[PDB]
Structures are given as structure tokens and as C-alpha cells.
Amino acid sequence: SALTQPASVSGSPGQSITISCTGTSSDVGGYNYVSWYQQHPGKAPKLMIYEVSNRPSGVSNRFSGSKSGNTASLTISGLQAEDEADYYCSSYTSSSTLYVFGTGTKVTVLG
Ligand SMILES: [Ca+2]
């Protein structure tokens, strides 16, 4: 199965929002290899977080990653209009799929 994500998360400018990503003990709960990606419409995906909480360069420190048990979370602090995009998680898995992805969350920013 895919990782479970909410279809839609919204916020006002300046709000802190969190996107959940739920798997199992064979993926999100078994390893520290959770990544998060941002995709604006018609653009290439961008790696925002890897290894649960690590940011590549060029990613705002307003983005942070964590996990607890079988659920990973992406938190966006100080929400800005430019954050309106789709967000996906992935995890390494012990299974043959090797990596498993979430179904994606559309973030809408008020205004
Ligand atoms: Ca908007």
C-alpha cells in the first residue's frame, strides 16, 4: 500500500501547518529514510527533506520534518503564498517496492 496522506491541508499566511504521512513498521516506522517533496503545478518536483528531518540547501528553514511511530510529519511554519503546492512523502521499505510514496497533499494558502 501507498503511504497515507490527507488530500488537502490549508492555512492562512503566517500559520503553522503539518502534513501527516502514515505507513507501517516495515517503512516509516522501521527506518529513518523518510523524504518529502514539493511540486508546483507543471514544474519539476523539489526535494525538501530527507532522512526524516534533513534539508538540502535552498530549502527554507520554515520547513521541518519529524516522525513518531509509523507517522512522519512535515511542518511548514510561517506559511507563505509560495508554499501553495502539492507535497508527497516517501520512505525506504524492507519490501520489494524498495521505496513507497504517499498519495500527496494539496496545500492551499488563504488569499
Ligand atoms: Ca491561495
Numbering used by the authors: 4 to 114
Question: What are the paper's exact sentences on this?
Answer:
The LCs are composed of an N-terminal variable (VL) and a constant domain (CL). Even though full length LCs and other proteins have recently been found as part of fibrils, patient biopsies predominantly revealed VL domains that result from proteolytic cleavage of the LC as the main constituent of amyloid deposits. The patient variant (referred to as Pat-1) contains 11 mutations in the VL domain compared to the corresponding germline sequence (referred to as WT-1). To determine potential structural differences between the two VL variants Pat-1 and WT-1, the X-ray structure of both proteins were solved to 2.5 Å (Pat-1) and to 1.55 Å (WT-1) resolutions.
The corresponding germline LC sequence, named WT-1, was identified by database-assisted (abYsis, IgBLAST) primary structure alignments searching for the germline LC with the lowest number of residue changes with respect to the Pat-1 sequence. However, incubation of the VL domain of Pat-1 revealed the presence of fibrils after a lag phase, while the WT-1 VL stayed soluble. The melting temperatures (Tm) at which 50% of the protein is unfolded were determined to be 48.9°C and 57.0°C for Pat-1 and WT-1, respectively. In WT-1, this proline is not involved in a hydrophobic interaction network. The hydrophobic interaction pattern of the WT-1 L81 misses one interaction each in FR2 and in FR3 but two more interactions to the C-terminal region appear. Overall, this leads to three hydrophobic interactions of L81 to the C-terminal region (V109, V111 and L112). Q82 however forms hydrophilic interactions to four residues, all located in FR3: R64, E84, D85 and E86. We therefore cloned WT-1 L81V and analyzed its properties. The thermal stability of WT-1 L81V decreased by 5.5°C compared to WT-1 and the cM value for chemical unfolding, is reduced by 0.42 M GdmCl. In the same line, upon incubation the WT-1 L81V mutant showed an increase of ThT fluorescence indicating fibril formation.
